[PDB]
Amino acid sequence: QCVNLTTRTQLPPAYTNSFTRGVYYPDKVFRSSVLHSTQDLFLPFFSNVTWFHAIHVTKRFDNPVLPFNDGVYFASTEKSNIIRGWIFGTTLDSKTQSLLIVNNATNVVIKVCEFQFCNDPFLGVYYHKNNKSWMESEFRVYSSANNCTFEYVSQPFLMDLEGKQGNFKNLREFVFKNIDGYFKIYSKHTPINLVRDLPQGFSALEPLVDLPIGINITRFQTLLALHRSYLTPGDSSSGWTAGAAAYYVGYLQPRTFLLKYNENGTITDAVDCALDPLSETKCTLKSFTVEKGIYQTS
Amino acid sequence: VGYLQPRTFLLKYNENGTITDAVDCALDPLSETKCTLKSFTVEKGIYQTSNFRVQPTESIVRFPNITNLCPFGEVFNATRFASVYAWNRKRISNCVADYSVLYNSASFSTFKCYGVSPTKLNDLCFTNVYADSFVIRGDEVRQIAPGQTGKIADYNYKLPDDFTGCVIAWNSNNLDSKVGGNYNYLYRLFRKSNLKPFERDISTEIYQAGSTPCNGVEGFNCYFPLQSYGFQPTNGVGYQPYRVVVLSFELLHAPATVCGPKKSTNLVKNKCVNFNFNGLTGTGVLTESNKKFLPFQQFGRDIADTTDAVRDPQTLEILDITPCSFGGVSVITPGTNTSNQVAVLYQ
Amino acid sequence: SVLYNSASFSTFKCYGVSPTKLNDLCFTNVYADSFVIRGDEVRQIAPGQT
Amino acid sequence: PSKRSFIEDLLFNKVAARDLICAQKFNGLTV
Amino acid sequence: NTLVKQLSSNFGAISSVLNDILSRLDPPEAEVQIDRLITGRLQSLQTYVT
């Protein structure tokens, strides 16, 4: 029911840099061929975020609990479906209504209930020897669900639950915001084809859902899934493998961003007005290519 | 027999205090120029006037068709609700939301809509309608307000500062009371923290008061945070229970399909006609647009912060709006001392 | 804050200062005037009345 | 067609909604 | 360009379009916003004329 995972080699959290990422659609007004400025929470450009690996190779598996603020950006580079869902809570002891958004092999379950989380919640697929097929088996998350208010179940889909190689074939960008008790989730998918590091380019995230949870979120954890084989040493709590995916978590900050709209009505260029005096001058003059000369700022 | 019309008349008063000369400044451009210059003597020259504004002919109101009606018998006339600390939340969508049904139903006591007029609830469209129903005391009615004092507005319910929604409250002394003491409704009293706007809490833990650690003991300085009520049909008017329902909705934001009883009529373009879309009213000419919108937007603006493109909530098409007031009008006159023959010029 | 958990009032009106901002301000010359009136005279105790 | 020389011609040559003139005409700005 | 961009400023209002304010609030409540917008536009026009 509630057990702890062992036999792992922890690594120091590496630091990487983001190349223009963390821009969504804060407004619902169509704008094209016009430069608009607004004050919202966005990811700082050319900053420094963390990178957690997950290569089986000792292996590498981490599942920490990070404090929630006013906007969390999640960039998941996956190729065999490793990162499953999310759990948002405050105390996590059957005392405060916690949110659980899990992506099961059949449906997607979004439940706002006072769950009793164990010391290490996760999921676990098993590989049979008599029949070469994968199927979800272990579900070591919550022990019981007492009071429940919001429960949503998605439509059945198709999932092979089979691990495949061939570099990162999927990139999922998520943005979670908490405004007046409402949880705004922005989601975007991209069929990438990179080896590692951070995907370059620009991507404007679209509004996915707005759940009326009506609760306070201070901490969040990423519920993941392991894969066990038919020749696991010992019991089913130490012979599991790592995986093949990566995830970057970033905290959004209320910074002034200057947007450049094209003829398609989509955001194609973003400039952080609070990063450098040249960027401040560009945001004040509403331009992107300043010539030669002196200028007065703040 | 003649019918009078509201016209702008220029009157001349002499030393006797009686009317001597009257000029109808709403028929000829010469009279308009005389009224602008405020003098009967007009010199030879040219003067600009108002722009050519095409008068509207039709007024269309495009709204999505609704085939359902929101239930009002279990919201404003229910027989069993919940407490204030655990208010019942309901989602209202895909139905006709009306406000005139509150006059021929139950007898309500208080009804106030903050952020929106109480006469445009049927003309405007609602987005994400959330109904929060609870029961409080008669003396705690004034505490339920966007920004007030009291323990109910701090440890139970909480309203935002820029709240744009309606709040109704009606007495129910013969529904949530009994002669043997009613203890079915509880309210939070002891808490060491406030509450964010639109937040629910159902914590039943022991509150730690003072410098004495409680941790489950139920004794001195360890009172229960949830205190019961005392509704009974024997006290005064200040102790009777009151059912309060708060309806929260967004005005002009996400393309919702709720709205009210208004539906779609006809669609006419290439003419200066009035158009109503999701409550937003405008006057202009509709033209077949070419730039599509986004699957989360409804209206469109530009550098002037004006509605330039609208989305039809019927065929999911985009239509551009153009102002039907175009053209500069000028009047050329040779002077009143010469003759009376003005020339009209369009630039 | 110790007046809500021990007694119940009918009208609490603070003119010149919001009730939600009475925790970070300082009071000078606190004068308390208590009296007893009727139920219809409660509206007569306000700055600028008849 | 005019009465300009080579230097004069050189000096002369050296000097809805989305459109600038159409958007300015909707607010009364005329040239 | 400045005259064009000044039309987007609300000058202390909820929106720059008068029809957006007249559709949700009654004229007795939007009169102050209309007057503020008129004063701002008049000040901008006076500055441009100077």
Cβ atoms within 10 Å of A189's Cβ, excluding its own: 11
Tokens representing residue A75 in the block? 């960039």
Residue A63 CA to residue A54 CA, distance in Å, equals 11
Q: Does residue B36 contact residue B29 with C-beta atoms inside 8 Å?
A: no
Q: Does residue A64 contact residue A44 with C-beta atoms inside 8 Å?
A: no
Instruction: Report yes or no: C10 at the B interface, CB cutoff 8 Å.
Output: yes
Residue B101 CA to residue B108 CA, distance in Å, equals 11
Tokens representing residue B134 in the block? 């609870």
Residue B322 CA to residue B339 CA, distance in Å, equals 41
Tokens representing residue A259 in the block? 């947007």
Residue B90 CA to residue B96 CA, distance in Å, equals 16
Question: Which chain A residues are closer than 8 Å to B298 by Cβ?
Answer: 28
Q: Does residue A252 contact residue A72 with C-beta atoms inside 8 Å?
A: yes
Length of chain C: 50
**Single-letter code of the amino acid located at B325:** S
Q: Which residue in A97, A101, A94 sits closest to A74, CA to CA?
A: A101
Residue with tokens 């202009």: B284
> Cα A147 to the chain's mean position, in Å?
27
Beta-bridge partners for A173 = A75, A188
The shortest CB-CB distance from C10 to any of B151, B189, B238 is to B238
> Cα B211 to the chain's mean position, in Å?
49
Residue B209 CA to residue B193 CA, distance in Å, equals 12
A130 SS3 class: coil
Q: Does residue A209 contact residue A226 with C-beta atoms inside 8 Å?
A: no
E31 SS3 class: helix
Instruction: Report yes or no: B156 at the A interface, CB cutoff 8 Å.
Output: no
Instruction: Report yes or no: B347 at the D interface, CB cutoff 8 Å.
Output: yes
Cβ atoms within 10 Å of A61's Cβ, excluding its own: 22
Q: Does residue B275 contact residue B62 with C-beta atoms inside 8 Å?
A: yes
Phi, psi of B135, deg, nearest 5: -130, 130
Q: Which residue in B196, B195, B218, B197 sits closest to B207, CA to CA?
A: B218
Tokens representing residue B216 in the block? 């489950």
Residue with tokens 């021990």: C6
Q: Does residue A38 contact residue A27 with C-beta atoms inside 8 Å?
A: yes
Tokens representing residue E17 in the block? 């379009």
Tokens representing residue D13 in the block? 């040559």
Cβ <8 Å between B198 and A30 = no
Residue E21 CA to residue E8 CA, distance in Å, equals 14
Radius of gyration, CA atoms only, chain A: 21
Q: Does residue B257 contact residue B126 with C-beta atoms inside 8 Å?
A: no
Residue B139 CA to residue A129 CA, distance in Å, equals 70
Q: Which residue in B13, B33, B30, B32 sits closest to B21, CA to CA?
A: B13
Residue B283 CA to residue B107 CA, distance in Å, equals 41
Q: Which residue in B326, B319, B321, B328 sits closest to B283, CA to CA?
A: B321
Residue E2: Cβ-neighbour burial (10 angstroms; 0-12, 13-18, 19+): exposed
Cβ atoms within 10 Å of B207's Cβ, excluding its own: 17
Tokens representing residue B31 in the block? 């009279």
CA distances from B178 to A246, B108, B182, B244 (A): 62, 21, 6, 20
DSSP B205: P
**Single-letter code of the amino acid located at A70:** D
**Interstrand relation of A108-127 and A134-153 (parallel, antiparallel or unpaired):** antiparallel
Phi, psi of E31, deg, nearest 5: -65, -40
> H or E segment at A49?
strand A49-51
**Interstrand relation of A72-78 and A207-211 (parallel, antiparallel or unpaired):** unpaired
> H or E segment at E33?
helix E27-49
**Interstrand relation of B272-277 and B59-62 (parallel, antiparallel or unpaired):** parallel
Residue A84 CA to residue B183 CA, distance in Å, equals 45
Q: Which residue in B87, B104, B130 sits closest to B258, CA to CA?
A: B130
Which residues does a gap of C–N over 2.5 Å follow in chain A? Answer: 57
Length of chain A: 298
> Cα A75 to the chain's mean position, in Å?
5
B·C CB contacts under 8 A: 20
Cβ atoms within 10 Å of B9's Cβ, excluding its own: 13
Sequence-separated (6 or more) residues with CB below 8 Å from residue A116: A93, A94, A142, A143, A144
Residue B155 CA to residue B159 CA, distance in Å, equals 12
* % helix, strand, coil for chain A, step of 5: 5, 50, 50
Q: Which residue in B88, B85, B87 sits closest to B202, CA to CA?
A: B85
Q: Does residue B39 contact residue B253 with C-beta atoms inside 8 Å?
A: no
For the four alpha carbons of E26, E29, E31 and E34, in that order, the dihedral sign comes to negative
Tokens representing residue B326 in the block? 């175009």
At residue A91's C-alpha, the angle toward residues A87 and A92, to 5°, is 50
Residue A4 CA to residue B5 CA, distance in Å, equals 88
Residue A198 CA to residue A193 CA, distance in Å, equals 12
Q: Does residue A121 contact residue A98 with C-beta atoms inside 8 Å?
A: no
Residue B176 CA to residue B199 CA, distance in Å, equals 25
Radius of gyration, CA atoms only, chain C: 13
The shortest CB-CB distance from B124 to any of E7, E8, E23 is to E23
Residue B87 CA to residue B133 CA, distance in Å, equals 6
Q: Which residue in A64, A90, A41 sits closest to A213, CA to CA?
A: A90
Length of chain D: 31
Residue B158 CA to residue B148 CA, distance in Å, equals 9
CA dihedral A94, A99, A100, A106 (to 10 degrees): 120
B·E CB contacts under 8 A: 42
Q: How many CA atoms lie within 13 A of D13 on its CB side?
A: 7
Phi-psi region of A59 (alpha: psi -120 to 50; beta: other; left: phi over 0): left
Q: Which residues of B119-155 are buried (b: 16+ CB within 10 A; e: fewer)?
A: ebbebbbbbbbbbbbbbbbbbbbbbbebebbbbbbbb
Helices (H), chain A: 277-285
Q: Does residue A136 contact residue A104 with C-beta atoms inside 8 Å?
A: yes
Q: Does residue A124 contact residue A140 with C-beta atoms inside 8 Å?
A: yes
CA dihedral A228, A234, A235, A240 (to 10 degrees): -30
CA distances from B220 to B206, B207, B217 (A): 12, 11, 9
Q: How many CA atoms lie within 13 A of A271 on its CB side?
A: 22
Q: Which residue in B280, B279, B323 sits closest to B304, CA to CA?
A: B323
Q: Does residue A210 contact residue A28 with C-beta atoms inside 8 Å?
A: no
Tokens representing residue B196 in the block? 């964010």
**Single-letter code of the amino acid located at B217:** V
Length of chain B: 347
Q: Does residue B96 contact residue B261 with C-beta atoms inside 8 Å?
A: yes
CA distances from B93 to A293, B277, E19, E24 (A): 58, 18, 26, 20
Q: Which residue in A230, A237, A235, A224 sits closest to A7, CA to CA?
A: A237
3-state SS, one letter per residue, for chain C: CCCCCCCCCCCCCCCCCCHHHCCCCCCCCCCCCCCCCCCCCHHHCCCCCC
State the DSSP string of B166-180: EEEEEE-TTTS--TT
The shortest CB-CB distance from D23 to any of B51, B304, B347 is to B304
Tokens representing residue B101 in the block? 């049904």
**Interstrand relation of B59-62 and A23-24 (parallel, antiparallel or unpaired):** unpaired
**Single-letter code of the amino acid located at A104:** N
Cβ <8 Å between B198 and A28 = no
Chains A and C touch (3+ CB pairs under 8 A): no
Question: What number of H helices and E strands is found in chain D?
Answer: 2, 0
Q: Which residues of C5-41 are buried (b: 16+ CB within 10 A; e: fewer)?
A: eeeeeeeeeeeeeeeeeeeeeeeeeeeeeeeeeeeee
- Greatest Cα pair distance, chain E, in angstroms, is 37
**Interstrand relation of A29-30 and B126-137 (parallel, antiparallel or unpaired):** unpaired
For the four alpha carbons of B192, B198, B203 and B204, in that order, the dihedral sign comes to positive
Helices (H), A196-288: 277-285
Question: Which chain E residues are closer than 8 Å to B304 by Cβ?
Answer: 4, 7-8, 16
Tokens representing residue D5 in the block? 């020389």
Q: Does residue B231 contact residue B241 with C-beta atoms inside 8 Å?
A: yes
Q: Which residue in B110, B199, B113 sits closest to B153, CA to CA?
A: B199
Q: Which chains touch D (3 or more CB pairs under 8 A)?
A: B, E
CA distances from A59 to A7, A81, A233 (A): 9, 17, 15
Residue B93 CA to residue B110 CA, distance in Å, equals 25
> H or E segment at D9?
helix D6-14
Residue B61 CA to residue B264 CA, distance in Å, equals 6
- Of all residues in chain B, the one with the smallest CA distance to C11 is B142
For the four alpha carbons of B228, B233, B237 and B243, in that order, the dihedral sign comes to positive
The shortest CB-CB distance from B302 to any of D17, D25, D28 is to D17
- Can you give the resolution of this entry in Å? 6.8
Cβ atoms within 10 Å of E34's Cβ, excluding its own: 14
A172 SS3 class: strand
Sequence-separated (6 or more) residues with CB below 8 Å from residue D22: D16
> H or E segment at A138?
strand A134-153
Chains D and C touch (3+ CB pairs under 8 A): no
For the four alpha carbons of A103, A108, A110 and A114, in that order, the dihedral sign comes to negative
Residue A13: Cβ-neighbour burial (10 angstroms; 0-12, 13-18, 19+): exposed
Q: Which residue in B64, B196, B203, B198 sits closest to B131, CA to CA?
A: B198
Q: Does residue A71 contact residue A78 with C-beta atoms inside 8 Å?
A: no
